[PDB]
Amino acid sequence: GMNPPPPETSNPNKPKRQTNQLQYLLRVVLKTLWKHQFAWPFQQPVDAVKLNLPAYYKIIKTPMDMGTIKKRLENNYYWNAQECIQDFNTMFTNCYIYNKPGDDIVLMAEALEKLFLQKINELPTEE
Ligand SMILES: Cc1sc2c(c1C)C(c1ccc(Cl)cc1)=N[C@@H](CC(=O)Nc1ccc(O)cc1)c1nnc(C)n1-2
């Protein structure tokens, strides 16, 4: 079968701006997760064809991954930090929704999410 198109990373119709919080989300949060030993499955959209997961995109109707988030941050796609935080949370949630407790991939997501939470705890005040 086929994969869906990836999430958009550009949209001139969507308002955006740079903020110090979004800068932190790139320089601290994304960078910390991206380098993690368990980042690799999350660095690009799930290829449900090569991974033989034909039900993946029946189950997961809002796909998200850090490759997409990285591009969105580098392109200044977002209006606010909450939009980006939501993309991270959607990514983790998708993994937990599709898979089962204790699966390796869930353990990987949990390791990344722990770090994500530690970093967003110190999101700076907007200025
Ligand atoms: C490139 C990607 S994306 C990505 C993965 C991979 C290999 C990995 C994944 C599984 C284990 C490890 Cl150690 C690393 C990544 N897991 C998939 C889900 C999956 O395929 N599960 C599965 C497992 C065994 C089996 O016989 C049949 C299906 C998944 N579910 N969410 C994501 C993300 N991923």
Swiss-Prot record:
Tissue expression profile of the protein: Ubiquitously expressed.
Domain of life: Eukaryota
Annotated site location: Acetylated histone binding: 99
Sites of the Glycyl lysine isopeptide (Lys-Gly) (interchain with G-Cter in SUMO2) crosslink: 58
PTM annotation, UniProt: Phosphorylation by CK2 disrupt the intramolecular binding between the bromo domain 2 and the NPS region and promotes binding between the NPS and the BID regions, leading to activate the protein and promote binding to acetylated histones. In absence of phosphorylation, BRD4 does not localize to p53/TP53 target gene promoters, phosphorylation promoting recruitment to p53/TP53 target promoters.
Domain Bromo: 17-123
Subcellular location per the Swiss-Prot or TrEMBL entry: Nucleus; Chromosome
Family the entry assigns: Belongs to the BET family.
Domains (record comment): The NET domain mediates interaction with a number of chromatin proteins involved in transcription regulation (NSD3, JMJD6, CHD4, GLTSCR1 and ATAD5).
Additional remarks: JQ1, a thieno-triazolo-1,4-diazepine derivative, and I-BET, a benzodiazepine derivative, have been tested on tumors with success. Treatment with GSK1210151A (I-BET151, a I-BET derivative) has strong effets on mixed lineage leukemia and promotes myeloid differentiation and leukemia stem-cell depletion.
Function noted in UniProt: Chromatin reader protein that recognizes and binds acetylated histones and plays a key role in transmission of epigenetic memory across cell divisions and transcription regulation. Remains associated with acetylated chromatin throughout the entire cell cycle and provides epigenetic memory for postmitotic G1 gene transcription by preserving acetylated chromatin status and maintaining high-order chromatin structure. During interphase, plays a key role in regulating the transcription of signal-inducible genes by associating with the P-TEFb complex and recruiting it to promoters.
Disease listed for this protein: Cornelia de Lange syndrome 6: A form of Cornelia de Lange syndrome, a clinically heterogeneous developmental disorder associated with malformations affecting multiple systems. It is characterized by facial dysmorphisms, abnormal hands and feet, growth delay, cognitive retardation, hirsutism, gastroesophageal dysfunction and cardiac, ophthalmologic and genitourinary anomalies. CDLS6 inheritance is autosomal dominant.
Assembly notes: Interacts with p53/TP53; the interaction is direct. Interacts (via CTD region) with CDK9 and CCNT1, acting as an associated component of P-TEFb complex. Interacts with RELA (when acetylated at 'Lys-310'). Interacts (via NET domain) with NSD3, CHD4, BICRA and ATAD5. The interaction with BICRA bridges BRD4 to the GBAF complex. Interacts (via NET domain) with JMJD6 (via JmjC and N-terminal domains); the interaction is stronger in presence of ssRNA and recruits JMJD6 on distal enhancers. Interacts with NSD3. Interacts with NIPBL.
Name of the protein this chain belongs to: Bromodomain-containing protein 4
Organism: Homo sapiens
The organism's taxonomic lineage, starting at the top: Eukaryota, Metazoa, Chordata, Craniata, Vertebrata
Portion of the full-length sequence here: 44 to 168 of 1362
